[model samples]
Target: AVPETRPNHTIYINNLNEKIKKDELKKSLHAIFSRFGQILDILVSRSLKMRGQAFVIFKEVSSATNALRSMQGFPFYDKPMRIQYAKTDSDIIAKM
Candidate 1:
């Protein structure tokens, strides 16, 4: 049977310096996941609360994995782009 958890359909990119912008991150995500499949939506944080992180939503979970496998640790913007599953909003709020 399919896993009860749909897997973390989002990717959390870390180590992003302030030099990067949300649009830049979005473009990077599209570049990575587009090779796998279509992308759905992407969310980026823009506050002191959460920095150097991004959320990428893919049309299929497989696409997320493909991006994670190919893009994680890849160098971008003079820093290594960290890609993984993103957490829920509640989780982020809890940190604050």
Candidate 2:
């Protein structure tokens, strides 16, 4: 998805390998990208249609921006991570 002008702290990630166990997937993602900053959420879907898709929300907008660029096309679990800033505002941000 294309990103826009608004400041967003969420990252949309695709091209993930769905075969990985959920806990391992979450833990792996957290360890790698949290290098950018603390994570607020990692929205991984279990639905077959949503396989390979996930959303990573960061506490800092700057962290999201950094992760998007740095993690784009990262090879993981026999797949490349397609990372981009989420086009819409994050629900966690709405929690504020």
Candidate 3:
């Protein structure tokens, strides 16, 4: 398909340190800049499989849209991240 990135609801974020637990990581992102929507809530992990990865949510579709790019390359909790919602499908958890 073509590229539009219009999907929203749950947002995907990566480039996190294996140690940057969602609490710390979440703090950094929120501190740097509060995003649009109600931030529905977010998730990192307990790490048997999906450490170093996270998924964030927005109550408002527009916010999810804006946040994805607004925070896309956002400076990491320690550095900058490596990529989201999906024309590709949320296969992120489909495997594990």
- Candidate number that wins on lDDT, 1 or 3: 1
Instruction: Assess each prediction's global lDDT (C-alpha) against the native.
Output: 0.68, 0.84, 0.62
lDDT of 3: 0.62
| Backbone clashes under 3 angstroms, per model | 1, 0, 1
Alpha carbon lDDT at 80, candidate 3:
72
Point out the worst 10-residue segment of candidate 3 by lDDT.
87-96
Error of 3 at 71 (Å): 1.3
Candidate 1 versus the native: TM-score? 0.73
56: Cα error in model 1, Å: 0.7
Off by over 4 Å in 2: 1-7
Write down the TM-score of every candidate: 0.73, 0.88, 0.69
Candidate 1's displacement at residue 76, Å, is 0.7
User: lDDT per residue, candidate 2, 1-96, as tens digits?
Assistant: 244435579888888998987778888999999899989988887688878888889999999988888888999998988877778777877787
Q: What residue pairs clash in candidate 2, if any at all?
A: none
lDDT of 2 at 43: 85
Best by lDDT: 2
Model 1 C-alpha lDDT per residue in residues 8-95, reported as the tens digit of each score = 5566677877667878877876776678666666777778866787777766667777778878788777888766566553343334
